[PDB]
Amino acid sequence: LTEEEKQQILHSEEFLSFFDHSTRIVERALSEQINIKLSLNRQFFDERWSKHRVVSCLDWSSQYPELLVASYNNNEDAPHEPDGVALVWNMKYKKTTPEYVFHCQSAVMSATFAKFHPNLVVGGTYSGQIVLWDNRSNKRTPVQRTPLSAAAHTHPVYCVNVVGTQNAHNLISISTDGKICSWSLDMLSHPQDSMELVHKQSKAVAVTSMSFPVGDVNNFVVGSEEGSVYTACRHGSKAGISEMFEGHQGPITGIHCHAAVGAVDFSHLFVTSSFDWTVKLWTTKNNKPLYSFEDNADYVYDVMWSPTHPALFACVDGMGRLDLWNLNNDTEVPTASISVEGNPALNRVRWTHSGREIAVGDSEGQIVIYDVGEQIAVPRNDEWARFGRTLAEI
Amino acid sequence: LTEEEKQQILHSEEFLSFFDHSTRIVERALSEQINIKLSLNRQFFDERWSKHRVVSCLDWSSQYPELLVASYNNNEDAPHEPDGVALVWNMKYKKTTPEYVFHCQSAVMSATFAKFHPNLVVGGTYSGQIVLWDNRSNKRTPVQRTPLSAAAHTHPVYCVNVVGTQNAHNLISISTDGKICSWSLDMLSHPQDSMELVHKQSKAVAVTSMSFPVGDVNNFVVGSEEGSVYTACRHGSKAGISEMFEGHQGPITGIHCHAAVGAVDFSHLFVTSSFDWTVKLWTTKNNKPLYSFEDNADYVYDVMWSPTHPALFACVDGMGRLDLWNLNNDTEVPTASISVEGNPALNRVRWTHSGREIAVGDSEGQIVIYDVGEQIAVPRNDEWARFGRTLAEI
Amino acid sequence: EVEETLKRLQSQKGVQGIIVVNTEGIPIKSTMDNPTTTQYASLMHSFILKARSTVRDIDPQNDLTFLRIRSKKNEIMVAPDKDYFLIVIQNPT
Amino acid sequence: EVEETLKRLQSQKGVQGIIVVNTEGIPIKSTMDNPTTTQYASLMHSFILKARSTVRDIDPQNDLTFLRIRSKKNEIMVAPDKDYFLIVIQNPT
Amino acid sequence: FRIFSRFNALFVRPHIRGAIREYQTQLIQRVKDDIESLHDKFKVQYPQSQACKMSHVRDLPPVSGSIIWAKQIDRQLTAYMKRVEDVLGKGWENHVEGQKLKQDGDSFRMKLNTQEIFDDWARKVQQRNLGVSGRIFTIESTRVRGRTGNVLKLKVNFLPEIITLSKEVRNLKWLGFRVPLAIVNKAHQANQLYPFAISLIESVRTYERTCEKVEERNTISLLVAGLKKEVQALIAEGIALVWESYKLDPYVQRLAETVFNFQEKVDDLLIIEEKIDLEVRSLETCMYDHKTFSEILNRVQKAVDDLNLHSYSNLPIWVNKLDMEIERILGVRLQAGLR
Amino acid sequence: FRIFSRFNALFVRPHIRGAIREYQTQLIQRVKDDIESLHDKFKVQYPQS
């Protein structure tokens, strides 16, 4: 009868594949195969990793349209416990448990998957340090960390993305001071490219978030908490600010470019959800806002285009209402709407790839995903044509 | 015990519990989840048997789509060396040597597999004897050899092909003089049917190519050495040539019917590869060359349709280029075109029965297995209608 | 209806009709290669009998109708009612 | 980690009892009591060894990576790869 | 209002205007209800509203957040007023309901002033007199609980909150509020000097963590002594520097790279150290056999050579001590075998 | 051939006719000596082509 060999083999941690496969199979074992318009589809609220916790970012895995990464800042509930909480939540089978967890010593502001590799996860934290995590390996510590240096990002980082294809990729990141930096997925210890973005008279732009024209690298569009949108070419013939926008009055929190591609070219349309209920539409060729969004006041967080419908997008109000806007059928009234129970401060919204359902963050950590009506999920050539003519309206 | 009481016990009507159990287990087991261009593809070039000795014909086994039959014809380097050599080359595994080797006393001009016997290779030679090769036998010589009597072929045979159902076969072959003969695959001492192809009374035909429309065995198309293609009937009161085609002013060096099924029929179409660089997309129901693709200074040598694309077809050339013509895409420039190194005179093209990748013969014996891109290989459901429109164009 | 069950089981992916093995280990129904299916079904019968012995060791009121033997190539579901042991090969996908 | 693993593997269904087994049978860990865990897991170890031989019969390269037995009274789990031998006592439903 | 916005073509013709003035009272009443709801929402204070903690998440300082929140609400009030003016026509205030509504809105807007908090914050900033000039970093005396001694823990002469102030300026400057030029200069200097301070503080924190980890395992400090000496030498060079200088960037950069190299060499040495210790412990109880003992010695010597080729500090004395320990263990095992 | 075959019936117009082949006569020179390159194949190949 062993008394120590089992004890020491338990102490020795060779359980990487063990734990990985056990997790991937037991949530499957939740299956009960015993032989004896908007609509909620799945509500997930991790009690252990989301108790009184604000969702910090949301991304859907392009390589794996079933994997979502969500972030968290420091927890005021307890400072001693790990502050930067990163969660990976899966679409494989119903379960309360999160599929993966991750810790960052600093508060995590944003996170996303990498397009270059289908398993690495990259996230920007409050300390301005890009943090790398490997999903296949079962670890809690950051795999890599960019240096906290003068050249590198130092102010809190809110936007990180991967541009290019799987052989011409490049990791772009912003610092709220205004530094743009390009790294590579292979090494996260030296900025391949880096410069402090400036608009004029050497004054920087307090960038909050950016997006990029769909299917295009370089020539990004950024938003400023100062209340101005800027189009800046990454390298071009001259890096830095290329165009300044009349923009919106208050701080510009969420910015996104049109993503649905069809018989017409609509990649020049920006949505910007400022802090004044004002989810503004416009185009890079026109310095003025194209259409002003007004149904209430006081902080709509953000907006993202549905990748499947060219004239439909999702924006959420911090009061607790997520509402789906079609542009073809209606210009002003919400074509779809819902309010998450508890009327909580819903933070971040992310359209899943290929659309057909939405992911919603919250200040309470209770993230909710749910689909959309078929009659409004699917586009048609009529939709693109009538969208073009609604653009011709004004 | 034995296989008679099981029948009665199944006929017994206590099977309600069994049927309920089966229904329950099947309905519970219904749910299933997971646990967690032109490119040079391969070479084939012997050295013992493939010194000069240009390629003559190629094929793929219907039962064994991983197998290619070649036939290197010309013996001019060494009179003492074997005259005709047919090599069979495997696709599943890469070997510098041919899988199996066969040599005939005369010079082989054409070879093909046997549909009924998946363990047999039949080939035609220059002298005029139809030649077998039983792969079971260890002896490289021909196993069964057709007599060179006036009953059988007496002129250099150029087309051999076995057709019919698995229970009713016929090995058709045609010689340059034009005597078509069907043999039984298992008995070749006597031609079980024969008939000399002749046009309008007292006009012999110099047959040098043929193809059977898919499915049909009773009627077929032949390309004569005199540049005038014909359609003939194998069995019937009108057995023989039944059509004049004005065709082309040079020898016909290749022919192939359409090789796709599933949508609107195109068996009436075929392409002939003339001797002046003029491939001819062109049909049986009409008499006038539908279109006359022309370019280049030299002349084509062989042409086949794609076995799954209802539009694509390859094209041999004299300076060594292989090009693919996608009519639905384009009718004027080859959709794809790449040149083999050393610019020798290519002599045979054969597409895999899958159609996903092409082969090509050579002037120096180096058979080259090329691969094609997915977008350029596999058609779509709308591809057939697009071909219909392109043909209805003129 | 036996043929109804045959077409129903055929509908399941990776499955060729319905094959049923009795208590003798010889399949009452013929769908796959006979020698392989008979020897393999005798092995299944031995293992289900020994598993029945163990389950009756501690659970003398339990019955076996479900067993998930999956490898990285194929899965077998084996289902004994009282004499008929349904066996269905099914890909993990 | 150990305690977190058993905690998450148990609270996922409020499982009656699970212990971690990284050795070939004869586990000294317990969740409810020593005997009903140790002897039952040893018998499961013998049977998964026999099932490993059973699945190697059809082809030696195949291995059993996962075993379920959902019977009328018990729903018993194991996920063997090289020495990780799960045990789960749970309701059939 | 949206229904009317669908139709504005013969509002110049006073024919539809009869219809709009027919329901003018309903319009005024419902607009008053809406603005009452808005002012009720405002009455819930910024720190009491989730918007405040959110804006905390936003890298937005609380004062700027409250100011801008109030400004946005005032903007929405002004939008209400101007849009009422446009929809109803010129001079709706002539009506008793119209002048009542305009007086109400003026009252709420007066209650919704914003410059006073700006003035208060500027006054407080001037009074507290935030500054960063001084020493590069400070060394202080703390009696850390758990030890009776007075620990001289090292810190950095830089309050992390100063950058916060800069951000307020960085937000208030474009908000239209003008701040004292002394505050502007202080905030600008702090903003441009922040990267050096944050790099220095993270470097010193990492050094302290790795050095306490080293001293936790005393068997390795002798090997790490050289790296600790060079780190202390750079610290000694730096501490003499006043807070602001021109060698700040090169010194800070070389200090950061030195600390990172020190930490990585520390961790590599530590892991190889537990490897060697585990192998020695295995040798302790290893079965009596020349082959197994020779293999253990071979692996230990290979690890020692791996350490040697990395060019660490103070190898020979460490080798001598481990040789003494291994020979003591060998003597004990020889005793057991001989008996 | 095909690039002016895109015109074919276009240059029947009074001005297109003046817009075509008055400007490209030297590319007709180019296709002439492309015929030169063509006959090069004929020049010395007869029994060893």
Q: Are E17 and E87 in contact (CB under 8 A)?
A: no
Question: Between B and C, how many CB-CB pairs are < 8 A?
Answer: 43
- One-letter amino acid for residue B83 of the chain: D
Which CATH number do you get for residue D33?
3.30.450.30
Residues 6 or more apart whose CB falls under 8 angstroms from that of B219 comprise B213, B231, B232, B233, B234
Max intra-chain CA distance, chain F: 51
Using DSSP's 3-state secondary structure scheme, residue A88 falls into strand
What's the rounded Cα separation, in Å, for the pair E166 and E176?
Answer: 16
| Residue burial B82-118, b: 16+ Cβ < 10 Å; e: rest | bbbbbbbbebeeeeeebbbbbbbebbbbbbbbbbbbe
Using DSSP's 3-state secondary structure scheme, residue A284 falls into coil
What's the rounded Cα separation, in Å, for the pair B301 and B346?
Answer: 7
What's the rounded Cα separation, in Å, for the pair E72 and E69?
Answer: 5
Please say whether the dihedral angle defined by the alpha carbons of residues E186, E189, E192 and E198, taken in this order, is positive or negative.
negative
Report which secondary-structure segment, H or E, holds A67: strand A67-72
Rg (CA), chain B: 24
Question: Which of C47, C55, C59 shows the shortest C-beta gap to D54?
Answer: C47
What's the rounded Cα separation, in Å, for the pair D45 and D38?
Answer: 10
The beta strand positions in B238-366, using DSSP E, are 240-241, 254-257, 269-273, 279-283, 312-315, 321-326, 336-339, 349-351, 357-360
Please say whether the dihedral angle defined by the alpha carbons of residues E210, E211, E216 and E221, taken in this order, is positive or negative.
positive
Residues 6 or more apart whose CB falls under 8 angstroms from that of D9 comprise A22, A26, D15, D18, D88
**Which CA distances in Å does B227 have to B117, B280, E57?**
35, 12, 83
Question: Which of E50, E73, E249 shows the shortest C-beta gap to A345?
Answer: E50
Nearest to A86 by CA among A116, A129, A131, A146: A131
What's the rounded Cα separation, in Å, for the pair A224 and B217?
Answer: 75
Alpha helix stretches (DSSP H) within chain B: 5-11, 16-28, 374-377, 381-392
Nearest to D79 by CA among D89, D93, D68, D69: D68
How many CA atoms lie within 13 Å of B294's alpha carbon, on the beta-carbon side?
9
Please report residues of A whose CB lies closer than 8 A to that of D22: 6, 9-10, 15, 18
Please report residues of A whose CB lies closer than 8 A to that of D80: none
Percentages of chain F per state (helix, strand, coil), in multiples of 5: 65, 0, 35
DSSP designation for B213: P
What's the rounded Cα separation, in Å, for the pair E244 and E138?
Answer: 14
In this structure, how many other beta carbons lie within 10 angstroms of the beta carbon of residue C84?
20
What's the rounded Cα separation, in Å, for the pair E240 and B248?
Answer: 98
Q: Are A195 and A177 in contact (CB under 8 A)?
A: no
What's the rounded Cα separation, in Å, for the pair B91 and B81?
Answer: 28
Q: Could you tell me which residues of chain A have a Cβ less than 8 Å from any Cβ in chain C?
A: 33, 35
What's the rounded Cα separation, in Å, for the pair E208 and B139?
Answer: 83
Terminal alpha carbon distance of chain C:
29
For residue B82, list its beta bridge partners.
none
Contacting chains of C (3 CB pairs or more, <8 Å) are A, B, D
Which tokens go with A240?
């830095």
Q: What's the domain range around D87?
A: 1-93
Please report residues of A whose CB lies closer than 8 A to that of E195: 149-150, 154
CA distance D62 to chain C (A): 6
What's the rounded Cα separation, in Å, for the pair E142 and E154?
Answer: 10
Q: Are B64 and B353 in contact (CB under 8 A)?
A: no
Asked if A225 is an interface residue toward chain E (Cβ–Cβ < 8 A), one would say yes
User: Do A and D count as touching (3 or more CB pairs closer than 8 A)?
Assistant: yes
Rg (CA), chain D: 13
What's the rounded Cα separation, in Å, for the pair D60 and D83?
Answer: 18
Q: Cβ A31–B36 below 8 Å, yes or no? A: no
What's the rounded Cα separation, in Å, for the pair B294 and B299?
Answer: 9
What's the rounded Cα separation, in Å, for the pair E297 and E322?
Answer: 12
Asked if F2 is an interface residue toward chain B (Cβ–Cβ < 8 A), one would say yes
User: Do B and A count as touching (3 or more CB pairs closer than 8 A)?
Assistant: yes
**Strand ordering across the sheet containing B367-372:** B38-44, B367-372, B357-360, B349-351
If one counts the domains in chain C, the total is: 1
Give which of F35, F36, F41, F48 to mutate to test B binding, by max B Cβ within 10 Å.
F41
Which tokens go with C43?
């092995």
Nearest to C65 by CA among C9, C57, C55: C55
Rg (CA), chain C: 14
Give which of B6, B16, B28, B30 to mutate to test C binding, by max C Cβ within 10 Å.
B6
Using DSSP's 3-state secondary structure scheme, residue C21 falls into strand
Q: Are B43 and B340 in contact (CB under 8 A)?
A: no
| Residue burial A348-357, b: 16+ Cβ < 10 Å; e: rest | bbbbbbebeb
Please report residues of C whose CB lies closer than 8 A to that of A35: 65-66
Report which secondary-structure segment, H or E, holds B223: strand B219-224
- One-letter amino acid for residue B295 of the chain: D
What's the rounded Cα separation, in Å, for the pair C47 and C53?
Answer: 10
Asked if F15 is an interface residue toward chain B (Cβ–Cβ < 8 A), one would say no
Phi then psi dihedrals of residue A204, to 5 deg: -80, 180
**Which CA distances in Å does F34 have to A39, A221, B278, B292?**
70, 52, 19, 21
Q: Are A102 and A121 in contact (CB under 8 A)?
A: yes
For residue B209, list its beta bridge partners.
B223
Residues 6 or more apart whose CB falls under 8 angstroms from that of B303 comprise B254, B255, B256, B271, B272, B273, B279, B313, B314, B315, B316, B349
Q: What's this structure's resolution in Å? A: 4.5
In this structure, how many other beta carbons lie within 10 angstroms of the beta carbon of residue A36?
9
Please report residues of B whose CB lies closer than 8 A to that of C81: 17-18, 21
Nearest to A191 by CA among A146, A158, A157: A146
Relative to beta strand A159-163, strand A170-174 is antiparallel
What's the rounded Cα separation, in Å, for the pair A394 and A150?
Answer: 47
What's the rounded Cα separation, in Å, for the pair A172 and A115?
Answer: 12
User: Do C and F count as touching (3 or more CB pairs closer than 8 A)?
Assistant: no
What's the rounded Cα separation, in Å, for the pair F40 and F49?
Answer: 12
Terminal alpha carbon distance of chain A:
84
What's the rounded Cα separation, in Å, for the pair A60 and A69?
Answer: 7
Asked if F6 is an interface residue toward chain B (Cβ–Cβ < 8 A), one would say no
- Over chain E, what HEC string results? CHHHHHCCCCCCCCCHHHHHHHCHHHHHHHHHHHHHHHHHHHHCCCCCCHHHHHHHHCCCCHHHHHHHHHHHHHHHHHHHHHHHHHHHCCCHHHCHHHHHHHHHHHHHHHHCCCHHHHHHHHHHHHHHCCCCCCECCCECCECCCCCCCCECCECCCCCCCHHHHHHHHHHHCCCCCCCCHHHHHHHHHHHHHHHHHHHHHHHHHHHHHHHHHHHHCCCCHHHHHHHHHHHHHHHHHHHCCECCCCCHHHHHHHHHHHHHHHHHHHHHHHHHHHHHHHHHHHHHHCCCCHHHHHHHHHHHHHHHHHHHHCCCCCHHHHHHHHHHHHHHHHHHHHHHHHC
Instruction: Supply the DSSP string of B136-154, one letter for each residue.
Output: TSS--S-SSB---STTS--
Residues 6 or more apart whose CB falls under 8 angstroms from that of E227 comprise E261, E262, E265, E266, E313
Nearest to B42 by CA among B344, B358, B313: B358
Tallying the residues shown for chain C, one arrives at 93
Please report residues of A whose CB lies closer than 8 A to that of D26: 1-2
